[PDB]
Coordinates of C-alpha atoms in Angstrom, one line a residue:
Chain Z
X1 CA -47.7 -67.6 36.3
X2 CA -51.7 -68.6 36.7
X3 CA -52.3 -67.4 40.2
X4 CA -50.9 -64.0 39.3
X5 CA -53.9 -62.6 36.7
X6 CA -56.1 -60.8 36.9
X7 CA -59.0 -63.4 36.1
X8 CA -57.9 -65.9 38.8
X9 CA -57.5 -62.8 41.4
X10 CA -60.9 -62.2 41.0
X11 CA -62.4 -65.9 40.9
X12 CA -60.8 -66.3 44.6
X13 CA -62.0 -62.7 45.7
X14 CA -65.5 -64.2 44.2
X15 CA -64.8 -67.0 46.6
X16 CA -63.6 -65.7 49.6
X17 CA -65.0 -61.9 50.1
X18 CA -67.2 -61.0 53.3
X19 CA -70.2 -59.5 52.5
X20 CA -70.8 -56.9 54.5
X21 CA -73.7 -53.4 53.7
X22 CA -73.4 -52.6 49.8
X23 CA -75.5 -50.3 48.6
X24 CA -76.9 -47.0 46.0
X25 CA -76.2 -43.7 47.1
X26 CA -79.5 -41.4 46.6
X27 CA -78.9 -38.2 44.7
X28 CA -81.6 -35.9 44.1
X29 CA -82.6 -32.6 42.8
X30 CA -81.0 -33.8 39.1
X31 CA -83.8 -36.4 37.8
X32 CA -83.4 -36.2 34.2
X33 CA -79.6 -37.5 34.5
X34 CA -77.1 -40.3 36.4
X35 CA -75.1 -39.4 38.3
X36 CA -71.8 -41.8 39.0
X37 CA -68.0 -41.7 38.6
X38 CA -67.4 -39.7 42.2
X39 CA -64.9 -38.1 43.9
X40 CA -64.1 -39.5 47.4
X41 CA -66.4 -38.0 49.6
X42 CA -65.4 -34.6 51.5
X43 CA -66.8 -32.0 53.5
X44 CA -66.6 -28.3 53.2
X45 CA -66.9 -26.1 57.3
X46 CA -67.9 -29.9 58.9
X47 CA -70.8 -30.6 55.7
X48 CA -70.2 -33.4 53.4
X49 CA -70.5 -33.4 49.7
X50 CA -68.8 -34.4 46.8
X51 CA -68.7 -34.6 42.9
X52 CA -70.3 -36.3 40.4
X53 CA -70.2 -36.9 37.2
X54 CA -73.3 -36.9 35.6
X55 CA -75.2 -37.4 31.7
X56 CA -78.2 -39.0 30.9
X57 CA -78.4 -42.5 30.4
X58 CA -78.6 -42.3 26.6
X59 CA -75.9 -40.2 25.8
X60 CA -72.1 -40.8 24.9
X61 CA -69.6 -38.6 25.2
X62 CA -72.0 -35.4 27.0
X63 CA -70.7 -35.1 30.7
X64 CA -70.7 -33.1 33.2
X65 CA -69.2 -32.3 36.5
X66 CA -71.7 -31.7 39.6
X67 CA -71.6 -30.7 43.0
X68 CA -73.9 -32.0 45.5
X69 CA -74.4 -31.9 49.1
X70 CA -75.0 -34.5 51.8
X71 CA -79.0 -34.2 52.4
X72 CA -79.2 -37.8 54.9
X73 CA -77.7 -41.0 55.0
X74 CA -76.3 -41.9 51.6
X75 CA -78.3 -38.6 50.1
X76 CA -76.8 -36.0 47.8
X77 CA -78.8 -33.5 46.9
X78 CA -77.4 -31.0 43.5
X79 CA -76.1 -27.4 45.0
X80 CA -78.4 -25.7 41.8
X81 CA -75.7 -22.1 41.8
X82 CA -72.4 -24.7 41.4
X83 CA -69.6 -24.1 39.0
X84 CA -70.2 -26.6 36.8
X85 CA -67.3 -28.4 34.7
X86 CA -67.6 -29.9 31.1
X87 CA -65.1 -32.8 32.1
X88 CA -65.2 -36.4 32.7
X89 CA -64.1 -39.3 36.6
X90 CA -63.7 -35.8 38.7
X91 CA -60.7 -36.3 41.6
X92 CA -59.6 -34.3 44.4
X93 CA -57.5 -34.3 47.1
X94 CA -55.4 -31.5 49.6
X95 CA -52.6 -30.4 49.0
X96 CA -50.4 -27.9 51.1
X97 CA -54.0 -26.4 52.3
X98 CA -55.3 -26.2 49.5
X99 CA -57.7 -28.0 46.9
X100 CA -56.2 -30.2 44.0
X101 CA -59.7 -31.0 41.5
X102 CA -59.0 -32.4 38.4
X103 CA -61.0 -34.5 35.3
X104 CA -61.2 -35.3 32.4
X105 CA -61.4 -32.9 29.3
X106 CA -63.0 -34.3 25.7
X107 CA -62.0 -32.5 22.7
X108 CA -64.2 -33.6 19.6
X109 CA -63.9 -32.8 15.8
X110 CA -66.3 -33.1 13.2
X111 CA -68.8 -34.8 15.9
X112 CA -66.2 -37.4 17.2
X113 CA -64.0 -37.5 19.6
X114 CA -60.8 -36.7 18.9
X115 CA -59.0 -36.3 22.5
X116 CA -58.4 -35.6 26.0
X117 CA -56.4 -34.6 28.3
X118 CA -57.0 -33.7 31.8
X119 CA -57.6 -30.6 33.4
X120 CA -56.8 -29.4 37.0
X121 CA -57.6 -26.8 39.3
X122 CA -56.5 -25.4 42.6
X123 CA -57.2 -22.9 45.4
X124 CA -60.2 -22.8 47.2
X125 CA -62.6 -25.3 47.3
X126 CA -65.1 -22.6 46.6
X127 CA -63.7 -20.9 43.4
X128 CA -61.9 -23.5 41.7
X129 CA -59.0 -22.6 39.3
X130 CA -57.9 -24.0 36.1
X131 CA -54.2 -23.8 36.6
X132 CA -52.1 -26.9 34.1
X133 CA -53.6 -29.5 31.8
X134 CA -51.8 -33.2 31.6
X135 CA -50.2 -34.9 28.5
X136 CA -52.4 -35.4 25.1
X137 CA -54.4 -38.4 25.6
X138 CA -53.4 -39.1 29.2
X139 CA -55.6 -39.5 32.4
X140 CA -55.2 -41.8 35.6
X141 CA -52.9 -39.0 37.3
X142 CA -53.4 -38.6 40.5
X143 CA -51.4 -36.2 43.4
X144 CA -50.8 -36.8 47.2
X145 CA -49.3 -34.7 49.6
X146 CA -45.4 -36.2 51.0
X147 CA -44.9 -35.8 54.8
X148 CA -41.9 -33.7 53.8
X149 CA -44.5 -30.7 52.0
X150 CA -43.6 -32.4 48.8
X151 CA -45.9 -34.0 46.1
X152 CA -46.8 -37.1 44.4
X153 CA -47.4 -37.8 40.9
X154 CA -48.3 -40.7 39.6
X155 CA -48.6 -40.9 36.1
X156 CA -50.3 -43.4 33.0
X157 CA -48.3 -44.2 29.8
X158 CA -51.6 -48.7 30.3
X159 CA -48.5 -48.3 33.0
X160 CA -48.5 -46.6 35.7
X161 CA -45.3 -44.2 36.5
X162 CA -44.3 -42.1 39.5
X163 CA -42.8 -38.4 40.6
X164 CA -42.0 -36.2 43.0
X165 CA -42.3 -32.3 42.6
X166 CA -41.7 -29.8 45.6
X167 CA -45.0 -27.9 45.2
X168 CA -47.8 -27.3 41.9
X169 CA -46.4 -24.3 41.0
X170 CA -44.6 -27.0 39.1
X171 CA -47.6 -29.3 38.2
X172 CA -47.0 -29.1 33.7
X173 CA -47.1 -32.1 31.4
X174 CA -43.6 -32.5 30.5
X175 CA -43.3 -33.2 34.4
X176 CA -46.0 -35.5 34.7
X177 CA -44.6 -37.1 31.3
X178 CA -41.3 -36.9 32.5
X179 CA -42.2 -40.0 35.5
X180 CA -40.5 -43.3 36.0
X181 CA -42.8 -46.6 36.0
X182 CA -43.6 -48.1 38.9
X183 CA -42.3 -51.6 39.8
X184 CA -45.5 -53.6 38.5
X185 CA -44.3 -57.5 40.0
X186 CA -47.2 -57.7 42.4
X187 CA -50.0 -56.6 39.2
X188 CA -48.9 -60.1 36.8
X189 CA -50.8 -59.1 33.6
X190 CA -53.6 -56.1 35.0
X191 CA -53.7 -52.6 33.3
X192 CA -55.6 -50.0 35.4
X193 CA -54.2 -46.5 37.7
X194 CA -54.6 -45.0 40.6
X195 CA -58.1 -43.1 42.0
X196 CA -57.2 -41.5 45.4
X197 CA -53.6 -41.6 47.3
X198 CA -53.3 -41.6 51.2
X199 CA -50.9 -40.7 53.0
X200 CA -50.0 -43.0 55.7
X201 CA -48.6 -42.8 59.3
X202 CA -45.8 -44.4 57.6
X203 CA -44.6 -42.3 54.9
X204 CA -45.9 -45.3 52.8
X205 CA -49.0 -44.1 50.6
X206 CA -52.2 -46.0 50.2
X207 CA -53.4 -46.3 47.3
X208 CA -57.2 -46.7 46.3
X209 CA -57.3 -48.0 42.5
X210 CA -59.3 -50.2 39.2
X211 CA -57.6 -53.1 37.6
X212 CA -59.5 -54.8 35.2
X213 CA -59.1 -57.6 32.0
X214 CA -61.0 -57.8 28.8
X215 CA -63.8 -61.0 29.4
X216 CA -65.9 -61.6 26.1
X217 CA -70.4 -62.1 26.4
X218 CA -72.2 -65.5 23.9
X219 CA -71.7 -62.9 20.7
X220 CA -68.0 -63.0 21.4
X221 CA -68.1 -59.0 22.0
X222 CA -66.3 -57.9 24.7
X223 CA -67.2 -56.8 28.4
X224 CA -64.4 -54.1 29.8
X225 CA -63.9 -55.9 32.9
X226 CA -62.6 -53.4 36.0
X227 CA -62.7 -54.9 39.9
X228 CA -62.2 -52.1 42.7
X229 CA -58.6 -52.7 43.9
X230 CA -55.8 -51.3 46.1
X231 CA -52.2 -51.2 46.9
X232 CA -49.8 -49.7 48.7
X233 CA -46.5 -47.8 47.2
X234 CA -42.9 -46.7 49.5
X235 CA -41.7 -44.1 46.9
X236 CA -38.0 -44.5 48.2
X237 CA -38.1 -47.8 47.2
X238 CA -40.8 -47.6 44.4
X239 CA -42.0 -51.4 45.6
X240 CA -45.9 -52.0 46.3
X241 CA -47.2 -54.0 48.3
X242 CA -50.7 -56.4 49.4
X243 CA -52.2 -56.2 45.9
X244 CA -55.9 -56.7 46.4
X245 CA -59.1 -56.5 45.3
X246 CA -62.2 -54.9 47.2
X247 CA -65.2 -55.6 44.8
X248 CA -66.7 -56.3 41.7
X249 CA -70.0 -54.4 39.8
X250 CA -71.9 -57.5 41.5
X251 CA -71.1 -56.9 45.2
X252 CA -73.4 -53.9 44.8
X253 CA -77.3 -54.6 44.2
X254 CA -77.9 -56.0 40.6
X255 CA -78.7 -53.0 38.4
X256 CA -78.7 -52.1 35.2
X257 CA -75.0 -51.2 32.8
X258 CA -74.6 -48.2 30.9
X259 CA -74.0 -50.8 28.1
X260 CA -73.4 -54.5 27.7
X261 CA -69.8 -54.2 27.3
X262 CA -70.2 -51.9 31.5
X263 CA -72.3 -55.2 32.8
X264 CA -69.0 -56.2 34.2
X265 CA -67.4 -52.4 35.6
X266 CA -67.0 -50.2 38.8
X267 CA -64.5 -47.1 38.5
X268 CA -63.4 -46.5 42.6
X269 CA -63.9 -42.8 43.7
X270 CA -62.3 -43.9 47.4
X271 CA -62.3 -44.4 51.0
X272 CA -63.9 -43.3 54.3
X273 CA -62.6 -44.3 58.0
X274 CA -65.7 -44.9 59.7
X275 CA -66.2 -44.0 63.7
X276 CA -66.0 -48.2 63.8
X277 CA -62.5 -49.7 62.5
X278 CA -63.8 -50.5 59.3
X279 CA -63.8 -48.0 55.9
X280 CA -66.9 -47.3 53.9
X281 CA -66.0 -47.7 49.8
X282 CA -67.5 -45.6 47.0
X283 CA -67.5 -46.6 43.6
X284 CA -69.2 -45.5 40.0
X285 CA -71.0 -49.4 39.5
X286 CA -71.8 -50.0 35.2
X287 CA -71.6 -45.8 34.5
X288 CA -74.9 -45.5 36.0
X289 CA -74.9 -45.5 40.0
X290 CA -72.4 -44.6 42.7
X291 CA -72.1 -46.9 45.6
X292 CA -71.2 -47.8 48.6
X293 CA -69.8 -50.7 50.3
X294 CA -68.6 -51.5 53.9
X295 CA -64.7 -53.3 53.7
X296 CA -61.9 -53.4 56.4
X297 CA -59.1 -51.1 56.5
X298 CA -57.2 -52.1 53.1
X299 CA -53.9 -50.8 54.5
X300 CA -53.4 -52.8 57.3
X301 CA -50.0 -53.7 58.4
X302 CA -48.7 -50.5 56.6
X303 CA -50.2 -47.2 59.2
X304 CA -53.1 -45.3 59.6
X305 CA -54.7 -42.8 56.7
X306 CA -52.4 -39.1 58.3
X307 CA -54.3 -36.9 55.4
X308 CA -57.2 -35.8 55.2
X309 CA -60.1 -33.8 52.8
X310 CA -61.8 -31.3 55.0
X311 CA -62.2 -28.3 53.5
Chain C
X1 CA -56.4 4.7 3.3
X2 CA -54.7 3.4 6.7
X3 CA -57.2 2.5 9.9
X4 CA -55.7 5.7 12.5
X5 CA -56.6 8.0 9.3
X6 CA -59.8 6.4 9.4
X7 CA -61.2 6.2 12.8
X8 CA -59.6 9.8 13.2
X9 CA -62.2 10.8 10.1
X10 CA -65.3 8.7 12.1
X11 CA -64.2 10.8 15.8
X12 CA -64.8 13.9 13.9
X13 CA -67.9 13.0 11.7
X14 CA -69.8 11.0 13.4
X15 CA -73.6 11.4 15.1
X16 CA -74.1 11.1 18.8
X17 CA -76.8 9.4 19.7
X18 CA -78.0 7.1 23.1
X19 CA -75.5 5.9 24.4
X20 CA -75.6 4.0 28.1
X21 CA -74.1 1.1 29.5
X22 CA -76.3 -2.6 30.4
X23 CA -77.2 -3.6 34.4
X24 CA -76.2 -6.9 34.9
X25 CA -78.2 -8.4 38.6
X26 CA -76.9 -11.4 40.2
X27 CA -73.4 -11.2 40.4
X28 CA -72.3 -7.8 41.4
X29 CA -68.3 -9.2 42.0
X30 CA -67.7 -10.3 38.5
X31 CA -67.2 -7.8 35.6
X32 CA -69.8 -9.1 32.2
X33 CA -68.9 -8.0 28.8
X34 CA -68.4 -9.4 25.2
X35 CA -71.7 -10.6 24.9
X36 CA -73.1 -12.4 21.9
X37 CA -76.1 -10.8 20.4
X38 CA -79.0 -10.9 22.8
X39 CA -81.1 -12.8 21.5
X40 CA -84.9 -14.1 22.9
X41 CA -86.1 -17.6 24.0
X42 CA -89.9 -18.3 24.0
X43 CA -89.7 -14.3 23.5
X44 CA -88.5 -12.9 26.5
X45 CA -84.7 -10.7 25.6
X46 CA -81.3 -13.5 27.0
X47 CA -77.8 -12.7 26.7
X48 CA -75.0 -15.0 27.1
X49 CA -72.0 -12.7 28.9
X50 CA -67.8 -13.0 29.5
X51 CA -68.3 -12.9 33.3
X52 CA -64.7 -12.0 35.1
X53 CA -62.9 -10.9 38.0
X54 CA -61.8 -7.0 37.0
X55 CA -58.3 -8.5 38.8
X56 CA -58.3 -12.0 37.4
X57 CA -56.8 -12.8 33.7
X58 CA -57.7 -16.2 32.0
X59 CA -60.2 -17.3 34.5
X60 CA -64.2 -16.5 32.1
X61 CA -66.6 -18.4 32.6
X62 CA -69.9 -16.9 29.6
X63 CA -73.7 -17.0 31.8
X64 CA -76.6 -16.6 30.8
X65 CA -78.6 -13.8 31.5
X66 CA -82.5 -12.5 31.0
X67 CA -83.7 -9.5 30.7
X68 CA -86.1 -7.4 34.1
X69 CA -85.8 -4.0 32.4
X70 CA -84.6 -1.4 30.0
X71 CA -80.7 -2.5 29.6
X72 CA -81.0 -4.5 32.6
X73 CA -80.3 -8.2 32.7
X74 CA -80.1 -10.9 35.6
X75 CA -77.9 -13.7 36.0
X76 CA -80.5 -16.7 35.3
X77 CA -78.6 -19.5 38.6
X78 CA -79.6 -23.0 37.2
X79 CA -78.5 -23.0 33.9
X80 CA -75.8 -24.1 32.7
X81 CA -71.9 -22.2 32.9
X82 CA -69.1 -22.1 30.3
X83 CA -65.7 -22.0 30.6
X84 CA -64.9 -20.3 27.6
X85 CA -64.4 -15.8 26.8
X86 CA -66.0 -13.9 24.1
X87 CA -69.6 -15.9 23.4
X88 CA -71.2 -16.1 20.5
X89 CA -74.7 -17.4 18.4
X90 CA -76.4 -17.3 15.2
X91 CA -79.7 -19.2 13.9
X92 CA -78.7 -21.9 11.8
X93 CA -81.0 -24.3 10.4
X94 CA -84.1 -24.3 13.2
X95 CA -81.1 -24.9 15.8
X96 CA -79.2 -22.9 18.5
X97 CA -75.1 -22.8 17.1
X98 CA -73.2 -21.2 20.1
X99 CA -69.3 -21.5 20.5
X100 CA -66.6 -19.4 22.5
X101 CA -63.5 -19.4 22.9
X102 CA -61.4 -22.2 25.1
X103 CA -58.4 -21.3 26.8
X104 CA -55.7 -24.0 27.3
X105 CA -53.4 -23.6 30.0
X106 CA -49.5 -25.5 30.9
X107 CA -47.7 -24.7 34.5
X108 CA -49.5 -22.0 35.1
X109 CA -49.7 -20.2 31.4
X110 CA -51.6 -19.4 28.3
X111 CA -50.8 -22.3 26.0
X112 CA -52.9 -22.0 23.0
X113 CA -56.4 -21.9 22.6
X114 CA -59.5 -22.7 20.7
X115 CA -63.2 -22.6 19.0
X116 CA -65.1 -25.1 21.1
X117 CA -68.9 -25.2 19.0
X118 CA -72.1 -26.3 20.4
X119 CA -76.1 -27.4 18.6
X120 CA -79.1 -27.8 19.5
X121 CA -82.1 -26.8 21.4
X122 CA -81.5 -23.7 23.0
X123 CA -81.8 -24.4 26.5
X124 CA -79.4 -28.0 26.0
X125 CA -76.8 -27.0 23.8
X126 CA -74.0 -29.8 22.6
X127 CA -70.6 -29.9 22.0
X128 CA -69.8 -31.5 19.1
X129 CA -66.5 -30.2 16.9
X130 CA -63.8 -27.5 17.8
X131 CA -62.4 -24.8 15.1
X132 CA -58.2 -25.8 14.3
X133 CA -56.0 -24.7 17.3
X134 CA -55.0 -20.8 17.8
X135 CA -58.1 -19.7 15.9
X136 CA -60.6 -17.8 17.2
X137 CA -63.0 -15.3 15.4
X138 CA -65.0 -18.4 13.5
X139 CA -68.6 -17.3 13.0
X140 CA -71.4 -19.6 10.6
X141 CA -74.5 -17.8 8.9
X142 CA -77.6 -19.6 7.2
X143 CA -77.2 -18.8 4.0
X144 CA -81.0 -18.3 1.2
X145 CA -80.4 -21.5 -0.4
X146 CA -79.8 -23.2 3.1
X147 CA -76.3 -23.9 3.1
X148 CA -74.2 -21.9 6.1
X149 CA -71.1 -19.6 5.2
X150 CA -67.9 -19.7 8.1
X151 CA -65.5 -16.8 8.5
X152 CA -62.4 -18.1 9.5
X153 CA -59.1 -16.3 10.2
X154 CA -55.6 -16.9 9.5
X155 CA -56.9 -12.5 7.2
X156 CA -60.2 -13.0 7.5
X157 CA -61.8 -15.8 4.6
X158 CA -64.9 -17.3 3.5
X159 CA -65.7 -21.0 2.8
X160 CA -69.2 -22.8 2.3
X161 CA -70.5 -25.9 4.0
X162 CA -73.3 -28.0 3.5
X163 CA -74.6 -28.5 7.1
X164 CA -73.8 -28.3 11.0
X165 CA -72.5 -31.6 10.2
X166 CA -69.6 -30.9 8.3
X167 CA -68.0 -28.5 10.8
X168 CA -64.5 -29.7 11.3
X169 CA -61.1 -27.7 12.2
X170 CA -60.5 -29.1 8.4
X171 CA -63.2 -27.1 6.9
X172 CA -62.4 -23.5 9.1
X173 CA -58.6 -23.8 7.8
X174 CA -59.4 -24.3 4.2
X175 CA -61.1 -21.1 3.5
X176 CA -60.2 -18.6 1.2
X177 CA -59.2 -14.9 1.8
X178 CA -62.1 -12.7 1.0
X179 CA -61.2 -9.5 -0.9
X180 CA -59.2 -7.0 1.5
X181 CA -59.1 -3.7 -0.7
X182 CA -61.0 -2.4 1.6
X183 CA -59.4 -2.5 5.0
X184 CA -56.1 -1.2 4.1
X185 CA -53.2 -2.7 6.5
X186 CA -56.6 -3.1 9.3
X187 CA -56.8 -6.2 11.1
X188 CA -60.2 -8.2 13.1
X189 CA -63.1 -9.8 12.3
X190 CA -66.8 -10.6 12.1
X191 CA -68.5 -11.4 15.5
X192 CA -72.2 -11.4 14.2
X193 CA -72.7 -11.6 10.5
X194 CA -76.7 -11.4 9.1
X195 CA -78.5 -13.0 6.2
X196 CA -79.9 -10.1 4.0
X197 CA -82.8 -9.8 1.5
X198 CA -80.7 -9.3 -1.1
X199 CA -78.6 -12.8 0.1
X200 CA -75.4 -10.4 0.5
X201 CA -74.0 -10.9 4.3
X202 CA -74.3 -8.1 6.6
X203 CA -71.1 -8.3 9.2
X204 CA -70.6 -6.8 12.3
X205 CA -67.3 -6.5 13.2
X206 CA -64.2 -5.8 15.3
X207 CA -60.9 -3.8 14.1
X208 CA -58.2 -2.6 14.9
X209 CA -54.8 -1.0 15.0
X210 CA -52.1 0.0 17.4
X211 CA -51.3 3.3 19.1
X212 CA -49.0 4.0 22.0
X213 CA -49.8 5.5 26.4
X214 CA -47.4 8.7 27.0
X215 CA -44.9 6.0 28.4
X216 CA -45.0 4.6 24.8
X217 CA -46.6 1.6 26.6
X218 CA -48.8 -0.4 23.5
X219 CA -52.8 0.4 23.7
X220 CA -54.5 -2.4 21.2
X221 CA -57.4 0.3 19.6
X222 CA -60.9 -2.0 18.0
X223 CA -63.6 -0.2 17.0
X224 CA -66.6 -1.2 16.1
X225 CA -67.1 -1.8 12.2
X226 CA -69.5 -2.7 9.7
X227 CA -68.9 -4.2 6.2
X228 CA -71.5 -6.0 3.6
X229 CA -70.2 -9.6 2.0
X230 CA -71.1 -10.6 -1.2
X231 CA -70.0 -14.6 -0.9
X232 CA -70.7 -14.8 -5.0
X233 CA -68.4 -12.2 -6.4
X234 CA -65.7 -12.2 -2.8
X235 CA -66.2 -9.1 -2.9
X236 CA -66.9 -6.3 0.4
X237 CA -68.8 -3.1 0.7
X238 CA -69.1 0.0 2.6
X239 CA -66.3 -0.9 5.1
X240 CA -66.4 1.6 8.2
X241 CA -66.7 2.5 11.7
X242 CA -69.8 2.3 14.0
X243 CA -67.8 2.9 17.3
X244 CA -64.9 3.4 19.7
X245 CA -64.6 3.0 23.1
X246 CA -65.2 7.1 23.5
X247 CA -68.6 7.0 22.0
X248 CA -70.0 5.3 25.7
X249 CA -69.5 6.9 29.2
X250 CA -66.2 7.6 30.4
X251 CA -65.4 3.9 32.4
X252 CA -62.5 2.4 33.7
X253 CA -60.3 -0.4 31.4
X254 CA -60.0 -3.8 32.5
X255 CA -55.7 -2.6 31.9
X256 CA -54.3 0.2 30.4
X257 CA -53.9 -1.1 27.1
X258 CA -57.7 -1.9 27.2
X259 CA -58.4 1.8 26.9
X260 CA -59.3 2.4 23.8
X261 CA -61.0 -1.0 23.3
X262 CA -64.7 -1.9 22.0
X263 CA -65.2 -5.5 20.7
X264 CA -68.8 -5.5 19.4
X265 CA -71.8 -7.8 20.2
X266 CA -73.9 -7.7 17.2
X267 CA -77.1 -5.2 16.3
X268 CA -81.3 -4.9 17.2
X269 CA -83.2 -3.7 14.8
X270 CA -85.2 -1.3 16.3
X271 CA -89.3 0.0 15.7
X272 CA -87.7 3.2 13.9
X273 CA -85.5 1.7 11.8
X274 CA -82.8 2.8 13.6
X275 CA -80.5 -0.3 15.1
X276 CA -79.0 -1.4 19.0
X277 CA -75.5 -2.2 18.9
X278 CA -74.5 -3.8 21.5
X279 CA -70.5 -3.9 22.6
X280 CA -68.5 -4.9 25.2
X281 CA -66.8 -2.1 25.8
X282 CA -62.8 -1.8 28.3
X283 CA -63.1 -5.2 28.6
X284 CA -65.2 -4.3 32.3
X285 CA -68.7 -3.7 30.5
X286 CA -71.9 -3.9 27.7
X287 CA -72.8 -0.5 26.1
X288 CA -75.7 -0.4 23.8
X289 CA -75.1 3.0 21.1
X290 CA -78.1 3.6 18.7
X291 CA -76.9 3.7 15.0
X292 CA -78.2 4.1 11.8
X293 CA -78.9 0.7 9.8
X294 CA -76.0 -0.5 8.2
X295 CA -76.3 -2.0 6.2
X296 CA -78.5 0.7 3.6
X297 CA -78.2 -0.5 0.2
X298 CA -77.5 -3.9 0.6
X299 CA -81.6 -5.3 2.1
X300 CA -83.0 -6.3 5.3
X301 CA -81.9 -8.6 7.9
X302 CA -83.8 -12.1 6.7
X303 CA -83.0 -13.8 10.0
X304 CA -83.4 -14.0 13.6
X305 CA -82.1 -15.1 16.6
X306 CA -85.8 -16.3 18.0
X307 CA -86.0 -19.4 20.1

């Protein structure tokens, strides 16, 4: 259906959105590099931190992930001592009292990218231990602690899958590869994936996601459009609800993208609940910045967030 | 002919000289071992070390240390860390070539490993290729004509390539076996190659054999060895043992199977014409022992790791 195409959904979003606060985070200690595509802000002993993807603006395929400490409103400072990771697009959740951290590891052969895989780390936030990779050339793998203490795994074949495992000791390439597709009815032509899953008070999973479509520029060159989206997943019936767009690159202030094909690209990090009804939505913007924008709580009618990333 | 017999003759004929452990400061939680060769940055000695908690297996990183005294190295806290084992370093055509072994896991267990290679300025090393699946002990050396010699391990092989822009898994996998006649039953590989004034390559290496402990449990014996390689005839010369774990002071190994394990780093030339030989010892320490220059009759070292 025309209405169910992502371009149409995005057009209606731009016409109906409520303009509120939208800013870029300031990063200190690493002036040589951009910081973008962060994990969700999280706390260590009460203090906010974030893992950022760091890359020189002119460099491709040379990303690291570094730890930053909140030092002021919308301000994060490099933790100089902290472990660096040779990864892209970091993500973080708490699973059964321990940190589960991951990102994408790029392999090269003869100076060219030859493949990639997701690397997963567990343990105490201050001493993360690599323990398993996912399937060859699979990214957008995300984990969520369920109400019963089991773990929901979202897979990406672009088809999103789901499977329940008993514990992190069961995570491996075979079980991620075996996940069965979720109901795709709500998404029409959209491709994308989950970025941050939240256990809700109903036992449903609130998903902060990215979905995209293709546009062309004036020369007929492709523009990889990505929007910040959300939906709610009900594991028991394998059903989704309330798929919507939360934000686009043009919701944040004008700022150069890393390349022309990314001029309409945001890659979400996650939400933080504020001491008002509302959420702070964190996102990578144009593969050069991390932004924060105020939104309404996006899982209304499906319960409150009942998990946390407080370590 | 067998390496156990060669090692027994080494122990009865060796000339005992200076042998010490390096002190590492700033990372007291971890052992530091299996280092690259000591090298200089703007005239100051540095070293890359494999760092691991003593009780931890398969959680190694590589860190940069700066010389702070005689046989003393201090962690450089700002420096890039690498999730690798057994780092190595050489200068190729004015740039740094750094590598180590990256372990892959599945389901909490080792699934494989591969060597990752980095190039560029010593201050900003750039990952540009991996080697073949499950191959380590790959080493590169700059040749007299500006080309590059690549040592592989299947059996030790060698192949020439024109430049770092040609390094890839395929060319490493394609290397042809070196003449093995001198080595008898030894297995092992090159750790630090040196271009000599003759155009031969002096190789500081590791070679090993199996022994058993008093319970009949395996001991993975590894010795510090050397040999000289002549690419034009694919011939080796002067294969010998330079050192064993018992040449260093008594010190715990990481596990009982490593009680007779040294994993060499490289040599540095001394003012007196002898060498300092650096080695990993028992997977818990870095050692330095004074040896006679091991490539006598084959030329002087004519390359360097001064960055």
